[PDB]
Amino acid sequence: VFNRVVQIGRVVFIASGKDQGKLAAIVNVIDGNRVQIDGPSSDVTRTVRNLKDLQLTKFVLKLRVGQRTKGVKAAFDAAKVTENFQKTQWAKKIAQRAIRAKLTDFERYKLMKAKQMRNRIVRVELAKLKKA
């Protein structure tokens, strides 16, 4: 039922709080609530975070209990965690939202025009398919 677990080396994504929107690696578990994470290659300092602010990703690194910043960085670039994460819909949605939030008025106008044209054409094709 549960596939992703809080384990040493698990790559977590900081959902809320200080370093929101970044990835880090679990290097220790202090208790059921607090976990020490260090994302040296994702611009996250070695710190302790509440699990309530973290989200488990699908990447697990081959780390050692309390692996130092050097080792966790070596493992991060070895596994290429950032490229693989960017490949996922998880990161694609985030990038899309980042682009969305920064749209200008002219860009909004262009998007509206293009979107309505595309919708009209797709509706024509949908009518064609429905007739068959």
Binding site: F2, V6, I8, V29, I30, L56
Partner: peptide, 23 residues
């Protein structure tokens, strides 16, 4: 026991029932 149970290099556990608050 509460502290000892965390002295395991193979420690693993999920987050069973996550209630998330919209902000």
């Amino acid at each position: 026991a509460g502290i000892k149970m965390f002295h395991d290099a193979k420690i693993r556990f999920p987050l069973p029932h996550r209630v998330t608050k919209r902000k």
